[PDB]
Amino acid sequence: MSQSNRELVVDFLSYKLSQKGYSWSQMAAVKQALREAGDEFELRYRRAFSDLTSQLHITPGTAYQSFEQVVNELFRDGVNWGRIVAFFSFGGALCVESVDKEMQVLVSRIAAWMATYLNDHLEPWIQENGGWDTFVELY
């Protein structure tokens, strides 16, 4: 109960601080910049985004396969912040598609796949380029 209440307070305070241009913490700054970068990505390329995501066809047996094939090609020749934002947007779209197809159970798995890929195949590059602090500056 106490941890939950604490989390709720911090969440709300983080939000209100960001509406005026401030932040609760570095992590909250990263989360908000990533949220906005994803909005920007999906809006600036709305037609492309709808076109691409409308092609997705998930099953429990092929969800992982589809995730891995998209992400590996997205970062085929390396990493940059643009690709990282696209990676989050793709993950978001795949979760939405999952709920759309009454497969919400996939959402927690996709979150795991993303965190796993982030840890083992994106984190090294991010730390090479100054850590997440760099992106907040860059966005």
């Binding site: 998209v70 090609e73 997205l74 940059n80």
Partner: peptide
């Protein structure tokens, strides 16, 4: 396709990246 979504994500991501 999954690969060929991935490549044509990477058009969009490089063409987001280039303000970064």
């Amino acid at each position: 396709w999954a690969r060929e979504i991935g490549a044509x994500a990477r058009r969009m991501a490089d063409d987001l990246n280039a303000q970064y």
